Amino acid sequence: VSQETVAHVKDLIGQKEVFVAAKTYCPYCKATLSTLFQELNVPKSKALVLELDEMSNGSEIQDALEEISGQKTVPNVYINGKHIGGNSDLETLKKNGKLAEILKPVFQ
Q: For domain 1-108, is the CATH number 3.40.30.10?
């Protein structure tokens, strides 16, 4: 895991307000994307969703994410540069109202 790749991934995380690292065949990723973009209607134009299994540098990005967030699995969600976690973490925030609050500056 090179520092160059790590720096690049931090760049990607900050490009859009909502960042999601996922894999196309993962049900946890599907639930997270559904929650954010279908149920909550977060504008897709304010999000960068990486499907690592369809990225030539997917494994390198995932390794960089582990270094940056300590997380080893997908989905890996960031909102406004802050690490949110995975699908279960998203569900907890959704239920206690904190997800709606942190997405306030994003919704439009």
A: yes
